[PDB]
């Protein structure tokens, strides 16, 4: 979020702000966060709702105001951007469609795009990816490596924006 202000992007937050805060004032309390959560497909109790307030309100009344909203909104946008991406690579890697990448489905794709990586590197990237001792790369643990390995997850990230931008 580079802060360069126009009247359609901020007027995205005013139309959305009052979607959470149905009342009038301008603060999104436990119940202005909730009534929506249930309207947006998911179910939370008055208690785990509160912790979403607590994320951002580093000033603290118990209710989320605009710039402490904007702060949250661009955070969870970044989360679904991260998550989608790590699902995408996974899919363009795991071809079979089972969610368990045998080295085969990681190894060549890289090379097919000419990613330099030796197989000493890839084999190691599957050892630093092999806990209970099987040999292959599934979802959440492909995901988990994303957050040496430093550079490699910028190779993945980039090539995702390809097949996710050119998919959609």
Swiss-Prot record:
Q: Where is this region: Necessary and sufficient for interaction with PCP4?
A: 77-147
Q: Which GO terms describe its molecular function?
A: adenylate cyclase activator activity; adenylate cyclase binding; calcium channel inhibitor activity; calcium ion binding; calcium-dependent protein binding; nitric-oxide synthase binding; nitric-oxide synthase regulator activity; phosphatidylinositol 3-kinase binding
Start and end residues of each EF-hand domain: 8-43, 44-79, 81-116, 117-147
Question: Which PANTHER family does this UniProt record tie to the protein?
Answer: CALMODULIN LIKE 3, MYOSIN LIGHT CHAIN 1, 3
The record's InterPro entries line, in alphabetical order, gives: CALM/Myosin/TropC-like, EF-hand-dom_pair, EF_Hand_1_Ca_BS, EF_hand_dom
> What are the Phosphothreonine sites (modified residues) in this protein?
45, 111
Covalent crosslink: Glycyl lysine isopeptide (Lys-Gly) (interchain with G-Cter in ubiquitin): 22
Q: Which organism is it from?
A: Mus musculus
Protein's name according to its UniProt entry: Calmodulin-1
Q: Which UniProt keywords apply?
A: Acetylation, Calcium, Cell projection, Cilium, Cytoplasm, Cytoskeleton, Flagellum, Isopeptide bond, Metal-binding, Methylation, Phosphoprotein, Repeat, Ubl conjugation
Provide the effect of residue 121 to A: Decreases interaction with SCN8A in the absence of calcium
Modified residues annotated as Phosphotyrosine in this record: 100, 139
- In-chain residues carrying the UniProt-annotated modification N6-methyllysine: 116
Other notes on this protein? This protein has four functional calcium-binding sites.
* Gene Ontology CC terms, in alphabetical order: calcium channel complex; calyx of Held; catalytic complex; centrosome; cytoplasm; cytosol; growth cone; mitochondrial membrane
The gene from which this protein is expressed is: Calm1
